[PDB]
From a paper:
Here, we report the use of the TPBLA to explore the role of the protein sequence in determining the aggregation of the naturally amyloidogenic protein, β2m. β2m is 99 residues in length (10.8 kDa) and has a seven-stranded β-sandwich immunoglobulin fold that is stabilized by a single disulphide bond linking Cys25 and Cys80 (31, 32). The protein forms the noncovalently bound light chain of the major histocompatibility complex class 1 (MHC 1) and is important for antigen presentation. Another example is β2m, in which aggregation of the wild-type (WT) protein is associated with the deposition of amyloid fibrils in the joints of patients undergoing long-term renal dialysis (dialysis-related amyloidosis [DRA]). More recently, two single-point variants of this protein, D76N and V27M, have been identified in amyloid deposits in the viscera or tongue, respectively, with the former occurring in the absence of kidney disease.
Residue numbers in the entry: 0 to 99
The structure:
Amino acid sequence: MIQRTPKIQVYSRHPAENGKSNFLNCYVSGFHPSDIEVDLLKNGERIEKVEHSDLSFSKDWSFYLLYYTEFTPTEKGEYACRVNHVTLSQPKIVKWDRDM
């Protein structure tokens, strides 16, 4: 058996084909087992519509999830990614930094 804690990165990207649009991303990487719960939050509230959830695995059966959706950040509000995993004794909340 192996278990590996997910690394969690929260960042924003503009797709080059539509640069005015902006996407909030939570990249959850290197985890095992694959069982997981991942949400994007706005002001602590689950964002129910997340357009993209792309899961894959590597040769060593570590899993990778990109969880992302279109958003429009202003100076208002707090955005985050919340992850629950067996390796994590409490849910891990990683806030989005507007400079990322």
